[PDB]
Design a protein around this nucleic acid. Structure first.
Lengths: 125, 114, 209, 123, 56
RNA sequence: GAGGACCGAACCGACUAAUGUUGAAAAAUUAGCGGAUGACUUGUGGCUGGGGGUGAAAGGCCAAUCAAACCGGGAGAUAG
RNA sequence: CAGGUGGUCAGGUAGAGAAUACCAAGGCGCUUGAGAGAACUCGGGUGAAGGAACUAGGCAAAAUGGUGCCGUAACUUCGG
RNA sequence: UUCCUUGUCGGGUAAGUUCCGACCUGCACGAAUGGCGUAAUGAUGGCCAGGCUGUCUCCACCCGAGACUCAGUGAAAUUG
RNA sequence: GAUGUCGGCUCAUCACAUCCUGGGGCUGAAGUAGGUCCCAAGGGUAUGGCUGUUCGCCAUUUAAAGUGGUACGCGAGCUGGGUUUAGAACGUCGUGAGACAGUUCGGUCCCUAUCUGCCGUGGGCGCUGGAGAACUGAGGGGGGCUGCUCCUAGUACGAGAGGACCGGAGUGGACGCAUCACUGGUGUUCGGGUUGUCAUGCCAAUGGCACUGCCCGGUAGCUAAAUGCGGAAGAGAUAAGUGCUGAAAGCAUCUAAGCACGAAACUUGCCCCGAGAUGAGUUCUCCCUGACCCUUUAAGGGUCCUGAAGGAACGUUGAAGACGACGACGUUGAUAGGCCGGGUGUGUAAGCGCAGCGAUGCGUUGAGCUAACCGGUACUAAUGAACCGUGAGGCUUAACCU
C-alpha cells in the first residue's frame, strides 16, 4: 500500500535520488531551463523551489544551509544574488513544467522545466 | 479539521504545568475503591512526553520496592488530579529510555539549575 | 426506522467525568433532504430517497439537475434510499436532521472499507506462513495446497485465494451513540466505523437489540 | 503477556526464585496470561530450605508483567520484570506469607484479597 | 508447464483482439502558429497556448 | 629460535546454507568454512597407454569420456 | 560468458598487516531504457511481550569478537 | 554389535523410544581382519546447559532487485 | 516409450457409524453425576516431552481434544527425517565376490501455466431511440462455537454428605470483521550524537563513502500485541419424542379422518454480492421535432444540413489502484505542487560574545531545522477547442382518445 505517502522512488536507492536531485537542481539554476523526464521534473519542484524560498533571506546561516543542500558555491551565489531578489515578491511557484514529446531512445515522456521569469532580458548575463 | 479540534479543545485542561523530560514530578491520581475515592501519589522521573493536544501523554518511571515501574499518564484525563514538579533535571535528549538499563548512581540526573 | 447519510470526520476520544476514555468516531450529519418518495402504488415498495451536502452547479448533469428541480431541493453529492417502516410518513422536500437519533441508543454504520489493493492470502485470509528456514524453497508466504488429488480433479468454488481486499461495503452493528450534537450536526458513536476520513457513512438504528 | 516457557520471578517468600510457565489455564488454545491470570508453573530454582522445592508443579497468579496493564482511561502501568505468586495446586490460596514489590488493582477480587492485603504497594 | 495441444489460429486471433492500438483522438491547434500538437504539449517549433516558450 | 606448532591474508581447498537448476556458469555466485614452512603450493619441460597406466584406494582418474578411453576397421556383428 | 590464467610493480590516512575503510596516480559507471511502488520471489534493515515453545536437528539468523592487565578447573603423555 | 526392546534400575526433564551411569539375560563382543583404556586433536556422530535471537507463538513495517505498465529487441520445452 | 513412494508443513473438503454443544426415551434415574439407546453434521473439536515416525506412552490443559473418505487428500505447493543408488563400519551369513524390512555415519527434490478449474479485475456486445441516476431481489455467498461466576437458592431433592431443573445477569477463551482515538511496532523521505577517511583553499562550518557507517529518538501511512463490534432474539415447517380427541376393534389406542407441542439441523430473520435474472425487471430525470435523391420500394440506399443529452479523450490527481477500472478536480478552479500560518518531531543551530592554558562550558536560545499532517493561499500546472454520440425512435393486437 501507498496511502498518503509522497515522494517518488524513481527506481533508485535513497542516496542516488539525493545525489541526482542535487545535481539536477544545480543545473536548473545554472541554465534556468532544462529538459528531463516528466516524473523527474515533477519531483524536482519539491527540491529547487525550497532553495529559492531559502535564498530570499540572505544570511551566513542560510547560505551555509543552502550550500549543504547543493554543495556548489557558484550555485549558492546565483541563488542569493540573482534568484532571491528576482522572486522577492512571488509567493511560491517559481518553476514551470512544459510537457513536450517523447524521448527517442526509450519513449520516455519528456518535459521542460524552467524558472518563470526567464524573459527576454535574461540575455544580459 | 476544524470540527474535531473544536471538540478536543473543550475537553483539555487549562492549567497543566510545564515540565520537561528529566524532571521528577509527583502525579496525584484518583483511586476509586467503591464508595471512596482517594488521591494516590506517584513520584518519579519523566522519561517521555507525547504532545498531541488532547491526546497528550507522559510516562513517569520510579523504583518502587526494588522493582522499576513505569506509568504512562494521559495528561488531560480527569483521573490525573494534579501534577507538581519537584526538581528540574538537565538532560540532552527528549526520551530518556536509556534509564531503563541503569540503576543506583548510574541513573542519576543533574539538576537543571535554572 | 430510516437512517441518515453522514461523513466520517475522524476519530477522537471523550473523557467521562468518572475517568473513562471513550474512543469515538465523529460523523458529520448535515440536513438530509428528501428528494423522492416511493409508494406501493407507483413503485411497489415504500421508501424515501435523500440527498445531503452541496454540489457545484457546473458539476451536476441535466438529468440529475431535473431530478432535484422536481423535488425543489438543492443538489447534493449523491442519492441514497431508505426503506420506510410501517407508519413512517415523509414528504418530498422535507429536511431530516441529526436529532432523529436523539433517543436512539445503538446504531449500525455502513461504509466502504479502505482499499488494500491486491492482497496475499496471509493478509486477506489469515493463512499461516510456512517455515522461514529449515530448507524452505521460495515458499514462505505462498498458500500451499489448493485442493485434493484426482478424485475432485478441480478447485472448489469459493476457495480462499489472493485478490482484491477492502474497498467494499461493510456494516458495523450495534455501536453506542455517545452524543448527538444537533446544533453542530455532529454524531459521536463509540468505536470505529469503516472507511477513510471523509468517506460517506450510512447510519441507521440498530436492527438487532 | 505470559506464555509457555516464560520464566518468571517470584514475588513471595514461598522459597522459589525462578519458575517457568507450562500452561496458561482457562480456555482452549489460550495464548497469553496477563496480570490476574492463573498459570501452571514448574519450579526451576528454589532456596535451600523453602516451603517448595525444585521440580514441583504448582499454580501461580501473574502479578507483574513487562507488557503491563491498561487502565480504563488509557493509561498503562509497566514493570521491569514478570513476577507471579505461587498458589496451592488445588486450593488456589497463596503458599507464602509475604509479598515483595508492588502489585496492581487488577487483583482486587475476593479470590486474591489475601495478596492485596499483603502487598507493600498497590498500583 | 506447457501446452498439451497446439492452440489454433482462431484462439490466437481472439487473444489479440485487445492488442489493437488506439490512435490519438484529435490534435490541438495552436492559437498563434496554427500548428497541430498533442494537447497540453508544446508544438514542434516551441509554441504552447500561443506563446513562444522555447526559442529553438 | 625448534615445530607435518598457534591466529590469520595471498595461495590451495570445498564443511554448511541460500540462490541458480531452458543458469551469468554442462558444477558457479553470495555469506560463513579448512589448511596456510609443509605428507605445502605453483610455472615450464619430460616420462608412464587401454586388460594397460596411475591410484595416501573412491573402481578414483587417464582431454566435459571409464567395472576397461578415443578413432578407424572386421561391420550391414547378432537381436527367438 | 559473474568461471579459469604464471611472473613483476606496491603511494597517502588509520591499521600488526599485501586484512579492512576512505583516497592518490591511473582507470571506470559493467551495451536496453522509462515509469509504477500490488500479490509473490530474491537480497537486506528494524521489532512490543516471550526466548528453541520451531525443527529430524538451534538449519538459518542473532550473538561473541581488539589490546593491556588480573585471573583461570577436571584431567594430562607434564608439552598441554 | 541387543532380535525380543522404548529390557530393567538410577540420573537429567512438568513430561526423555535419544543421552549419561549401571545390571548381564552377550538373539549374534573379544584379544594384531587386535582387546580394553587414553591427554591432545576433529568443517566427525549423539546429548545437555548458559548466552543469543523473527526458528517459533504470529507475523508487522521498511529499503533495494524482479514481478506489473510503456518503448526497442526477442527465445524455449511441448503440440493427432 | 514412468501414475514420484512414508511422515511432517500449508491448505483443505465430504460422510455420520456424534467427541463437545442441542432435543429426547429407558434406567438397577433421589439430587449431583452417570449408563444406554434414538434424533441431530450448524459450529467447534489442545499445547508440549520422546521417536523419521502414523501410532503410542507421558506431562499439562479443554465444553470436547470424534471416527473415517478424499491416488493411505495435498512434492508442476514446501520439506527430505525415514524409506530405496554409489562411500564406510559393526553383528551375522558365505571359501569368496558379496548379502541381510538387521544396525550405523554420509549422501543434487527440475519445470517461465496453453486448456480445465479457482481467486480477482477489465474489454465487447446485448437488453429495441439515446443518456444520467436511484432501486427491486430471482439467485448466490458469508455467519451460526463455547467457558466461568452471580441471582433464583444452599431452595427442590437428600439420613447426611451434597446439591439442581426452568429462568435471569455479568464476565472470559477461541474465531471473524472493521479501525488507528489510545498503547505500541515500523518509519533508509525528519532531527540529533558519533568512529574512520576524503573533499569543499584553510579555520570554523558542511557534504560524500564506510550495511541507512554505526547508533539514539521520531511525523504521516501501514499495522497488532492495540480497541470497537459480531455469533442472537424472533418466526415458519419439522426430527426423535410427548400428546388431545377418536374409530376400525362395545373396550383400548398419539392416527386411520381431525387437532396441539417439539432441536445448534431445514426455510426465514443478520451481513455481503446480485437484472448477461437473455425470464436482460422497476422508478425518476434529461436530450433530439432538417431537407433531398435514388431504387428492385424496404426495419432500403445515398447526399446536403445538423451534432443535442451525454460520453470519451487529455490534463492535475486520490486514504482508488498491478494494468484497466473507480473517485475528485480542470480558471465560474483549492485537483496537485509551491507558498503562508499552525502542529508535530528533534532538542538550545550557525554566527557572535564571555569564561577557561585547553578539551569544552555559559549567554544570545526551547534555539535552529522539520517528510507524508492541519488551516489557508491561484504563485505554477490543470486551454479555446477538437472527437464520439444524432435528427422523435418496428410490427401486431387490446384497451383508451380521436
Amino acid at each position: 500500500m501507498r496511502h498518503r505517502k509522497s515522494g517518488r522512488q524513481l527506481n533508485r536507492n535513497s542516496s542516488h535520488r539525493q545525489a541526482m536531485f542535487r545535481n539536477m537542481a544545480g543545473s536548473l539554476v545554472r541554465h534556468e531551463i532544462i529538459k528531463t523526464t516528466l516524473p523527474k521534473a515533477k519531483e524536482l519542484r519539491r527540491v529547487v523551489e525550497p532553495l529559492i524560498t531559502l535564498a530570499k533571506t540572505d544570511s551566513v546561516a542560510n547560505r551555509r544551509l543552502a550550500f549543504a543542500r547543493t554543495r556548489d558555491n557558484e550555485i549558492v551565489a546565483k541563488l542569493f544574488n540573482e534568484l532571491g531578489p528576482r522572486f522577492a515578491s512571488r509567493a511560491g511557484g517559481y518553476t514551470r513544467i512544459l510537457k513536450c514529446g517523447f524521448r527517442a531512445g526509450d519513449n520516455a515522456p519528456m518535459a521542460y522545466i524552467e524558472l518563470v521569469d526567464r524573459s527576454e532580458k535574461a540575455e544580459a548575463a | 479539521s476544524n470540527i474535531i479540534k473544536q471538540l478536543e479543545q473543550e475537553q483539555m485542561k487549562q492549567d497543566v504545568p510545564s515540565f520537561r523530560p528529566g524532571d521528577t514530578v509527583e502525579v496525584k491520581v484518583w483511586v476509586v475503591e467503591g464508595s471512596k475515592k482517594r488521591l494516590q501519589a506517584f513520584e518519579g522521573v519523566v522519561i517521555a512526553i507525547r504532545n498531541r493536544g488532547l491526546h497528550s501523554a507522559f510516562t513517569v518511571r520510579k523504583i518502587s520496592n526494588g522493582e522499576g515501574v513505569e506509568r504512562v499518564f494521559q495528561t488531560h484525563s480527569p483521573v490525573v488530579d494534579s501534577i507538581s514538579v519537584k526538581r528540574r533535571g538537565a538532560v540532552r535528549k527528549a526520551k530518556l529510555y536509556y534509564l531503563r538499563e541503569r540503576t543506583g548512581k548510574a541513573a542519576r540526573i543533574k539538576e537543571r539549575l535554572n | 426506522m430510516i437512517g441518515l447519510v453522514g461523513k466520517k470526520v475522524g476519530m477522537t476520544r471523550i473523557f467521562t467525568e468518572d475517568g473513562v476514555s471513550i474512543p469515538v468516531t465523529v460523523i458529520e450529519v448535515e440536513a438530509n433532504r428528501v428528494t423522492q418518495v416511493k409508494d406501493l402504488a407507483n413503485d411497489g415498495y415504500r421508501a424515501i430517497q435523500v440527498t445531503t451536502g452541496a454540489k457545484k452547479a457546473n458539476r451536476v448533469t441535466k438529468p440529475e439537475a431535473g431530478h432535484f428541480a422536481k423535488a425543489g431541493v438543492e443538489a447534493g453529492r449523491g442519492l441514497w434510499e431508505f426503506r420506510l417502516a410501517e407508519g413512517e410518513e415523509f414528504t418530498v422536500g422535507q429536511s431530516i436532521s441529526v436529532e432523529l437519533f436523539a433517543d436512539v441508543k445503538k446504531v449500525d454504520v455502513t461504509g466502504t472499507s479502505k482499499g488494500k489493493g491486491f492482497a496475499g492470502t496471509v493478509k486477506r485470509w489469515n493463512f499461516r506462513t510456512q517455515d522461514a528456514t529449515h530448507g524452505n524453497s521460495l515458499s514462505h508466504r505462498v498458500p500451499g495446497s489448493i485442493g485434493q488429488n484426482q478424485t475432485p480433479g478441480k478447485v472448489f468454488k469459493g476457495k480462499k485465494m489472493a485478490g482484491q481486499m477492502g474497498n467494499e461495503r461493510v456494516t458495523v452493528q450495534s455501536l453506542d451513540v455517545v452524543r448527538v450534537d444537533a446544533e453542530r450536526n455532529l454524531l459521536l458513536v463509540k468505536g470505529a466505523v469503516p472507511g477513510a476520513t471523509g468517506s460517506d457513512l450510512i447510519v441507521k438504528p440498530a436492527v438487532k437489540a | 503477556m505470559i506464555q509457555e516457557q516464560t520464566m518468571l520471578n517470584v514475588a513471595d517468600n514461598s522459597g522459589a526464585r525462578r519458575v517457568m510457565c507450562i500452561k496458561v489455564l482457562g480456555g482452549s488454545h489460550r495464548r497469553y496470561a496477563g496480570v490476574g491470570d492463573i498459570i501452571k508453573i514448574t519450579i526451576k530454582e528454589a532456596i535451600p530450605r523453602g516451603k517448595v522445592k525444585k521440580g514441583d508443579v504448582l499454580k501461580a497468579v501473574v502479578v507483574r508483567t513487562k507488557k503491563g496493564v491498561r487502565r480504563p482511561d488509557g493509561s498503562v502501568i509497566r514493570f521491569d520484570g514478570n513476577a507471579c505468586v505461587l498458589l496451592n495446586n488445588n486450593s488456589e490460596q497463596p503458599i507464602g506469607t509475604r509479598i515483595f514489590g508492588p502489585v496492581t488493582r487488577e487483583l482486587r477480587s475476593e479470590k486474591f484479597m489475601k495478596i492485596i492485603s499483603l502487598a507493600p504497594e498497590v498500583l | 508447464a506447457v501446452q498439451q495441444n497446439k492452440p489454433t489460429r482462431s484462439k490466437r486471433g481472439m487473444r489479440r483482439s485487445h492488442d489493437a492500438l488506439t490512435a490519438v483522438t484529435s490534435l490541438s491547434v495552436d492559437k498563434t502558429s496554427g500548428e497541430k500538437h498533442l494537447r497540453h504539449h508544446i508544438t514542434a517549433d516551441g509554441y504552447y497556448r500561443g506563446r513562444k516558450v522555447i526559442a529553438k
